[PDB]
Amino acid sequence: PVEADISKLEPGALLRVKWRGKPVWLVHRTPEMLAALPSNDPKLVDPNSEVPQQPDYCKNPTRSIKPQYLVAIGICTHLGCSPTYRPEFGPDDLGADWKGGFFCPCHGSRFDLAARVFKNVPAPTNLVIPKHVYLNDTTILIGEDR
Amino acid sequence: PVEADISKLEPGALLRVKWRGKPVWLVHRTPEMLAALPSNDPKLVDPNSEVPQQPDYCKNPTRSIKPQYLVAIGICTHLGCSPTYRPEFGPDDLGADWKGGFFCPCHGSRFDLAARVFKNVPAPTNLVIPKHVYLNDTTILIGEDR
Ligand code: FES
Ligand code: FES
Ligand SMILES: [Cl-]
Known part of the structure; x- marks a missing residue:
C-alpha cells in the first residue's frame, strides 16, 4: 500500500500517487463540484455504481468515503x-x-x-476505485482498508 | 510500500515479506528474549547502533519502534x-x-x-532495518515512515 498526504491538496487540485504501477488520483472536490454531480445521473451509464468498480464504502453518489475527496485509478476503462x-x-x-x-x-x-x-463513449464502465482508508484527516492509505 | 499483517504472528514466530526484492523479517519477541539482549552488549560490535544501519527511531537497544517486534532485512551484511x-x-x-x-x-x-x-565474525555490521511505520497495532507498513 501507499500513503497519500493530502494535507496540502487545495480546492480543485489533483494529487497523483503510484500504486501497483498504476496512477491513483486524489481530487479535492469543492461544494460547487459536488452540487452538480446528481445532475449528471440521467446522462451516465452507471450513476448508482452497480458495476463493482469500487469497494462498497464508495458505492454511493460521490463514489467516495468523504464528499471532499475523490480517490480513483487514473486509467480509462476503454483501452x-x-x-x-x-x-x-x-x-x-x-x-x-x-x-x-x-x-x-x-x-x-x-x-x-x-x-x-457517460453514456455512448467507448469506455463502458466507471473508473476503478482502489481499496483505501483514511489513517487520519490528511492521510489516505491506498491499497488496503480496515 | 509493503504491508505486514502481524495480527497472527505468535510469540517467537517470524514473518517474512518481500520488499524491493529483499526479504523483510518481523519477529515477535517475548519478554524472555528481550530480557537477554543487554547481556549481549559486551560481545557485540555495535551494541548502540552507531553505524547507520537503521532509521533513527530504531537506533536503540532493541533496534525497533516497539520492543515486542523486531523488523529487519534478512540479508547477512557479510556477503x-x-x-x-x-x-x-x-x-x-x-x-x-x-x-x-x-x-x-x-x-x-x-x-x-x-x-x-557479534564480534569476530565475517559480517562487520548490524543487519539493515528498513524505513517502516505502524499503521495500527497489528499492521506495519514497510518502505515508508511519517
Ligand atoms: S482508452 Fe480512453 S476513450 Fe479509449
Ligand atoms: S554471507 Fe553471512 S557469514 Fe558470509
Ligand atoms: Cl526469505
Whole structure:
C-alpha cells in the first residue's frame, strides 16, 4: 500500500500517487463540484455504481468515503490511456453543460467528478476505485482498508 | 510500500515479506528474549547502533519502534546469504550462552535478537532495518515512515 498526504491538496487540485504501477488520483472536490454531480445521473451509464468498480464504502453518489475527496485509478476503462483532468465547467470543447470531470484523449470517453462514465463513449464502465482508508484527516492509505 | 499483517504472528514466530526484492523479517519477541539482549552488549560490535544501519527511531537497544517486534532485512551484511533464525537459548551448536538470534550458514556470522552482529565474525555490521511505520497495532507498513 501507499500513503497519500493530502494535507496540502487545495480546492480543485489533483494529487497523483503510484500504486501497483498504476496512477491513483486524489481530487479535492469543492461544494460547487459536488452540487452538480446528481445532475449528471440521467446522462451516465452507471450513476448508482452497480458495476463493482469500487469497494462498497464508495458505492454511493460521490463514489467516495468523504464528499471532499475523490480517490480513483487514473486509467480509462476503454483501452487504458490516462484521461485528462478537466475541472472547469462548460469549456467550449466539452460543451456548455459540462460540470467538470475527465476526458480521455485517446478515443473521447468522458467521466464526471465521481469518475462515472457517460453514456455512448467507448469506455463502458466507471473508473476503478482502489481499496483505501483514511489513517487520519490528511492521510489516505491506498491499497488496503480496515 | 509493503504491508505486514502481524495480527497472527505468535510469540517467537517470524514473518517474512518481500520488499524491493529483499526479504523483510518481523519477529515477535517475548519478554524472555528481550530480557537477554543487554547481556549481549559486551560481545557485540555495535551494541548502540552507531553505524547507520537503521532509521533513527530504531537506533536503540532493541533496534525497533516497539520492543515486542523486531523488523529487519534478512540479508547477512557479510556477503549476502540469508541467515538462519535460531530463537532457542543455548543450543549445543551455538553455545550454552546463546540467547536466541540469527546464524548465517555460509561463513558463520552471528546476530542477536535485535539483529546486532557479534564480534569476530565475517559480517562487520548490524543487519539493515528498513524505513517502516505502524499503521495500527497489528499492521506495519514497510518502505515508508511519517
Ligand atoms: S482508452 Fe480512453 S476513450 Fe479509449
Ligand atoms: S554471507 Fe553471512 S557469514 Fe558470509
Ligand atoms: Cl526469505
